[PDB]
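Practice problem. Given the sequence and the SMILES for chloride ion, write out the predicted structure.
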Amino acid sequence: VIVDLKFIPEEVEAALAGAFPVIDLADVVWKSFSGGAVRFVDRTLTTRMSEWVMMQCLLHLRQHRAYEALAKKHEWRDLSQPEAADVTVGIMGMGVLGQDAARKLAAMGFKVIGWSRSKRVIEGVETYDAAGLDAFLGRTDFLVGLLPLTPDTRGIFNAALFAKLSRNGPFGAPVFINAGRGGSQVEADILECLDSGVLGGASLDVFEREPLSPESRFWDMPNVYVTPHVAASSDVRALFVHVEHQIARFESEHVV
Amino acid sequence: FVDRTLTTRMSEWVMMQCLLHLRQHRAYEALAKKHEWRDLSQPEAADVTVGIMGMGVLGQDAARKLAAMGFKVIGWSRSKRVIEGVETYDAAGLDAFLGRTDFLVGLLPLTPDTRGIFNAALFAKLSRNGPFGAPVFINAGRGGSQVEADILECLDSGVLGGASLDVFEREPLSPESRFWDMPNVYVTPHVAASSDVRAL
Ligand SMILES: [Cl-]
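Answer key:
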């Protein structure tokens, strides 16, 4: 089997031991069977994404940066701490990813509301539509972006949207979390809102131009968490089980 | 004063620690400090076993929530307990429990049965077969249940790969403690659950 994948080479090399019981062209294609989304539909992407989203909401809720700054000073000091039920997480995007995250955040105690341009009826979650966007934003303390990039979501996360987020929550200023696509945000507005305090903090997994430039100001900011577009990663061992099975079945799905 | 929010608050902290360790937060922050964009190989929660010692109210709440997030979860208590949805181990099953555990979570009360229970000999029985090759220790019960000199020695030797500590043998933790500067140790000042003073 020909393997030409621009993934982590060590993870590919390691995953070949056992797989296809192998012309590895770094010595099945992704920037040379597709390596990602005959396509590969990795069933673990949703649950992986929800781990990242949950982690961001907890990092912000539990004041991780303030406690780490105290730890760096070797200073023992308890801070006033809201519970998850004191914070409304507003999720823009009520597809598979938004629905999974909503359910899990609510089970952890967060108040959760959802938004999509056209109304969706989601069991257990109050949802808002385009006409209800202002009301949705005004209730939201932690804004979570799980939207696709379409013409309707180009630069949707912008200065005016951030200015309509709630300032009535326990931190007095909203937080922005995005793991959809960088084209959905106006990065200059995010930076200016962080500098001005309109946004109290952010978690960004996606950027207008990836990989994020080493000169970006996002890297050093005290209340911004940067991840390199890894909210969900495929396991290459899972890809080969998909290729083995589809190679075997063909010898005995998911054609584009 | 019985603050009804303590359980759910505790589970927030426990969930946060398990995700911080799972998602390699320290490694990604070190990358960010270098302004270096680099993806790391990433297990999913289903690749990690969280073993919770203490299957009272706190342990049960945490176990349920960790399993809903995708973690493999097992529980331990000295007495046999049957807990819906969670595999549990008893006194006789302690060594088996430890050998299956990648992230050890302490949610025990402090009694003569739990005094200094988290010690070098216990850490030596934890799994090294998980995706990081070394176990992690997380404690939010009481500091009297751990032997801090053993935690430090195990971190130095690599017997423990990292830790999250909310409780300590002597609180407040001394400014001279080695815990504060370690790259894979998270320190919180006994705040896994705080009572809301308006409720008092
Ligand atoms: Cl939408």
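Check your answer against the key. The pocket of chloride ion is lined by residues A 116-117, 147 (CB under 6 Å).
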